[PDB]
Amino acid sequence: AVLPKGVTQGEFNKAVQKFRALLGDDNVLVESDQLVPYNKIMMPVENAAHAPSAAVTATTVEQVQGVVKICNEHKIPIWTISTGRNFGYGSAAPVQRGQVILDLKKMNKIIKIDPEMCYALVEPGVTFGQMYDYIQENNLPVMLSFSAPSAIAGPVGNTMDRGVGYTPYGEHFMMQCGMEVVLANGDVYRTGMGGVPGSNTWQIFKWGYGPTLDGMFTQANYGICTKMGFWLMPKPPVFKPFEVIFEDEADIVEIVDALRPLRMSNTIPNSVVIASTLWEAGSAHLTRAQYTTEPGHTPDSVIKQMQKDTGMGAWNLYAALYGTQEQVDVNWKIVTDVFKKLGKGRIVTQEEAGDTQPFKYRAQLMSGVPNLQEFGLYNWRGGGGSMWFAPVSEARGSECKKQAAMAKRVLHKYGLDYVAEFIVAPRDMHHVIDVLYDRTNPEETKRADACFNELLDEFEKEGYAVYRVNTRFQDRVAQSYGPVKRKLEHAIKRAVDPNNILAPGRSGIDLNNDF
Amino acid sequence: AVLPKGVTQGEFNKAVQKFRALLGDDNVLVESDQLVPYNKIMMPVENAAHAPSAAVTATTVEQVQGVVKICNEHKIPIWTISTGRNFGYGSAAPVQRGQVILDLKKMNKIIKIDPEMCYALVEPGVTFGQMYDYIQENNLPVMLSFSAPSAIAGPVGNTMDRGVGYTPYGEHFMMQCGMEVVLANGDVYRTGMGGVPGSNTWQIFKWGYGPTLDGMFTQANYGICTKMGFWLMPKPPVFKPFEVIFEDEADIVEIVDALRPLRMSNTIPNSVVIASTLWEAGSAHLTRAQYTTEPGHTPDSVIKQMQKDTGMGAWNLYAALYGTQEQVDVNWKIVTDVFKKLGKGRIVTQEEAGDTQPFKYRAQLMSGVPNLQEFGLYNWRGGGGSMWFAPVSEARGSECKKQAAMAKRVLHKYGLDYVAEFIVAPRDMHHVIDVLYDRTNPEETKRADACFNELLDEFEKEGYAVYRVNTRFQDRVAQSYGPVKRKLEHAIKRAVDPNNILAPGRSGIDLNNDF
Ligand SMILES: *Cc1cc2c(cc1C)nc1c(=O)[nH]c(=O)nc-1n2C[C@H](O)[C@H](O)[C@H](O)COP(=O)(O)OP(=O)(O)OC[C@H]1O[C@@H](n2cnc3c(N)ncnc32)[C@H](O)[C@@H]1O
Ligand SMILES: *Cc1cc2c(cc1C)nc1c(=O)[nH]c(=O)nc-1n2C[C@H](O)[C@H](O)[C@H](O)COP(=O)(O)OP(=O)(O)OC[C@H]1O[C@@H](n2cnc3c(N)ncnc32)[C@H](O)[C@@H]1O
Ligand SMILES: [Cl-]
């Protein structure tokens, strides 16, 4: 029987009794079969290491308040998820074995979509697909920022982990406005303008008055988000997605330095992607086995062959323009002039690309259309092993080259591939590297775990750290940011959750730690 | 003798002794004459209510750490200021009588200005004028976002109160990236990527990993900011400031609704201002006495006469376009088409305006050029009385009309004027109302205090609250946001400052409160 850390069967039984009284039997899952989908992980460790003791599906804020009351009474640690599609970051399983999962997928109402003020207010279980269908069927003049690869993922869960999309509203937390959280003591706290009785500005002005705390709850375990608002981009008259293909790995310095001023001036306004050959290949549903079944990493010689056969470059840049046709036309001239002056980069238009992949799904991503194309990355090697290694980088060419070379060296050392893309903000990149391996192979699984550890170590040696990470490594990554930060995080933790019931271990915040 | 609340002369003497040993006599100010500039306030209350017991000028982080050590030892409350130009919000004086002012103006180094990545990292005492002169003299391709009305105000102090400017980087806290604070226990905490040893991304990526806390320190008393970074806008090839004048007060509904889509699409990208007749007049250095010396508010009939004589409208909209000439030209056509279709609004160009005010200083504000023109508002009525009443509003015409009418009614009831402007974000307005009165007149000063209280009450009745407020009213405004918020703020306060030494009373956060 899986029980929470240091908690007795008797105390667990008492909590389950109370959870059933509060939520109804059908909302309290304690049977193995019922927990199966919750235990699925892609991390290089056996399922048992992240096995939940139970899952409870709350539907209302009052039920969430009831859940934390019970958790405090019997010291039950809960791992909160919204839509639970955190693949490559731990999926729906808890950070520590034995936690009860507080699954908020049933708390799924779209409270409001304002097409004039361009914002949405939603519950945790609201999915990207749900919002898209409502907006499209009702012809609302707004568009979404969508995070791959699941249409049943959603804005709340993604924003609580500070995920990203591919439109000009791609930095999801930047566009968040207003948040409601249930604190460990049961209090319902609304950030920003939400605490003002009769307010109509909760989704209008981010900060409110006094300390602005939305960020304190993201990537943290200081509260349970039950509602969140965010800004929506108004539907533009014209959308012009495009691609620029580069043939050589060494081109990354020039690509990034030519692109940066275009992003800094907002001439290209969306979160552009510069995808490596293998990310491009996997997103197009190509597999390593189609090219080689030899052990180890995929050789450069094979990759160049792949580039030859497919037209895919060493780097594949996907960007878009938005606005009136006249605005798009003027910005298109500026963009094409930059690449012409550079003397590198082949431009591919939406017309030329047609229904071919990856362009088709990239155009969908850049216009906020939910789609499942990127599940193809899971088939590059297959076997269910995938961890995102996502270091932050300056959007400076030399830095991107350095990080790409570092990651490639370490991955190859362990027989794995550099499958990556730079998601481009004006000043930063999320350098997203998909560490893919066959999790059904014990020898390879051990190499993947060792490889991920070495990637973290080698990047720290160069002053780099990741922006987000899977549950197996959340404590390790917390170390990257130093002891003073962890001490402050634990002081806040004690203040808002003295019984340590909210997801202890999240981002390395756990009162059992000596901080 | 002014002493901190409930603190003895003996304990205060011990702290002063230690402050002198740590900082040197010249950095410890306890004499009346030395405290004079610190005590100047524009709030409707006698100077004594905000009189500091002393001021200490620290220069280094180690000295700030030493100051908090001493404060904890002798329970000395400190009020931290950076450049201290918070006119209309309390100036440099403490929130509670008797606090020691920790004046960081000597901590004034520009640590870095990166013209490629477009960011700055500065100390608290760095001023807007200091940065402007460095950027201009060194021909750096970046521009500032400047908050009126002082060239010796600065980005750190302004951002710690979440102030605003008038370029596309006008929402100052939105562009902040990286912060260093000294906590009450002396620890030096760096947000975002700052805690990673050898990081080069502190001013590149805002969030870091785990809870992102920059916002928690703004408008709060949880730490002392000693360094702050922020993003800078790259200098555009072309800047095209312009104005649109509207003749009738009732036009505000249509002005705001026509402007909103232009802001939402980023076609007009800066924080536009829609200034009322009297704000326009005062900024042009006109005074009430030039038009009437009768008691009470300035009558509509006098204002219409003012409009006739000057060409100033009921609402005066100042905006700007930025980009290449071709981008500016296309956006100018879109903007002019909107106002032509509306059938209201007279466009005034930079060429037509020439060196005339207010256009001249507005063009400076919209291009980040420090200037002192708006000190003219202090001369509309003179006498040194000024408090900013700054309610948040949706950028929806009907809401703006409602708030303008509400404020005008309340101000007139108390014999004062509606002097205001809407600072326009895509979805929100900071509706900034300058409550001006003769502070040398006791009867009028009492009316101003009563008026400010009634403005707060009446706006709360309609679900509106302010984004920032003077020290005399910080506790009152905290009430606007509800008890759950205050309870959480006090729990965090206890956790990070158990001795209540950091500016108790700031934003209504004080451990002496029953929260
Ligand atoms: C596998 C994969 C993953 C992926 C991707 C492409 C592929 C092939 N592309 C991504 C992208 O474009 N952008 C991005 O940010 N992520 C991308 N991913 C990773 C992941 O699949 C998505 O991010 C997915 O959107 C995340 O799943 P979901 O949206 O369902 O979020 P969640 O699992 O519920 O929550 C994520 C974490 O947040 C914390 N949490 C969640 N809810 C709460 C509440 N209510 N309160 C407090 N904390 C909460 C948990 O830590 C949770 O694990
Ligand atoms: C009078 C007036 C005021 C004014 C204005 C026009 C006129 C005629 N126009 C403004 C504008 O365009 N935008 C805006 O945001 N404010 C405007 N004001 C008000 C004010 O003058 C300016 O905001 C000025 O920039 C503020 O002064 P300064 O920049 O010197 O900031 P400060 O006084 O040092 O600090 C402000 C408050 O922040 C907290 N504080 C400051 N430093 C710290 C540190 N290091 N750590 C923690 N907290 C800090 C204090 O609460 C302080 O009082
Ligand atoms: Cl996973």
Ligand SMILES: [Cl-]
């Ligand atoms: Cl003042």
